[PDB]
Amino acid sequence: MPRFWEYWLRLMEGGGENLYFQGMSVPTDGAVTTSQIPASEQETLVRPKPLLLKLLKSVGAQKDTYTMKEVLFYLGQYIMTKRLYDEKQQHIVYCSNDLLGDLFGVPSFSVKEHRKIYTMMASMTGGQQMG
């Protein structure tokens, strides 16, 4: 059986010492979301790029604004269904000349490089790169 999602879950159940040490600054306080029932799980909303929104909608995502955990959740389901992981190195994703490679700006990346994924994902929720 494959193990990609066991690695991807550690991004979402991650943070702390897994955060970046160069480039972007430490992310600001936010959320202020409800907790009136145990079903609550929500955090700060973001505006992901139209190129990423297409990928989220390829796995049936409903909204126009998203949480960082919602974007990662759906993106992990896309990588999972597309089988973009190496069959040997289950913790490494490969995608060139296709939508997920066009998003990440690299032919491949390690899922264990949580710090690098966090800064790349923070760039996807920034302004457009049409040029």
Swiss-Prot record:
Substituting G76A results in: No effect on its ability to induce apoptosis
Cellular compartment(s) = Nucleus, Nucleoplasm; Cytoplasm; Nucleus, Nucleolus; Nucleus
- From the record, what ranges are coiled-coil? none
Tissue specificity, per the record, is:
Ubiquitous. Isoform Mdm2-A, isoform Mdm2-B, isoform Mdm2-C, isoform Mdm2-D, isoform Mdm2-E, isoform Mdm2-F and isoform Mdm2-G are observed in a range of cancers but absent in normal tissues.
Q: How is it modified after translation?
A: Phosphorylated at multiple sites near the RING domain by ATM upon DNA damage; this promotes its ubiquitination and degradation, preventing p53/TP53 degradation.
| Region described as Necessary for interaction with USP2 | 24-120
- Where does the record place the region Sufficient to promote the mitochondrial pathway of apoptosis? 24-119
This entry's comment on induction and repression of expression is:
By DNA damage.
Record domain SWIB/MDM2: where? 44-120
Similarity-based family: Belongs to the MDM2/MDM4 family.
What does the subunit section of this Swiss-Prot or TrEMBL entry state?
A: Interacts with p53/TP53, TP73/p73, RBL5 and RP11. Binds specifically to RNA. Can interact with RB1, E1A-associated protein EP300 and the E2F1 transcription factor. Forms a ternary complex with p53/TP53 and WWOX. Interacts with CDKN2AIP, RFWD3, USP7, PYHIN1, and RBBP6. Interacts with ARRB1 and ARRB2. Interacts with PSMA3. Found in a trimeric complex with MDM2, MDM4 and USP2. Interacts with USP2 (via N-terminus and C-terminus). Interacts with MDM4. Part of a complex with MDM2, DAXX, RASSF1 and USP7. Part of a complex with DAXX, MDM2 and USP7. Interacts directly with DAXX and USP7.
Could you give the domain comment from the record?
Answer: Region I is sufficient for binding p53 and inhibiting its G1 arrest and apoptosis functions. It also binds p73 and E2F1. Region II contains most of a central acidic region required for interaction with ribosomal protein L5 and a putative C4-type zinc finger. The RING finger domain which coordinates two molecules of zinc interacts specifically with RNA whether or not zinc is present and mediates the heterooligomerization with MDM4. It is also essential for its ubiquitin ligase E3 activity toward p53 and itself.
Further information: MDM2 RING finger mutations that failed to ubiquitinate p53 in vitro did not target p53 for degradation when expressed in cells.
Described function: E3 ubiquitin-protein ligase that mediates ubiquitination of p53/TP53, leading to its degradation by the proteasome. Inhibits p53/TP53- and p73/TP73-mediated cell cycle arrest and apoptosis by binding its transcriptional activation domain. Also acts as a ubiquitin ligase E3 toward itself and ARRB1. Permits the nuclear export of p53/TP53. Promotes proteasome-dependent ubiquitin-independent degradation of retinoblastoma RB1 protein. Inhibits DAXX-mediated apoptosis by inducing its ubiquitination and degradation. Component of the TRIM28/KAP1-MDM2-p53/TP53 complex involved in stabilizing p53/TP53.
The record names the disease as: Seems to be amplified in certain tumors (including soft tissue sarcomas, osteosarcomas and gliomas). A higher frequency of splice variants lacking p53 binding domain sequences was found in late-stage and high-grade ovarian and bladder carcinomas. Four of the splice variants show loss of p53 binding.
Protein name, as recorded: E3 ubiquitin-protein ligase Mdm2
Q: Tell me what organism the protein belongs to.
A: Homo sapiens (Human)
The shown chain, on whole-protein numbering, covers 6 to 102 of 491
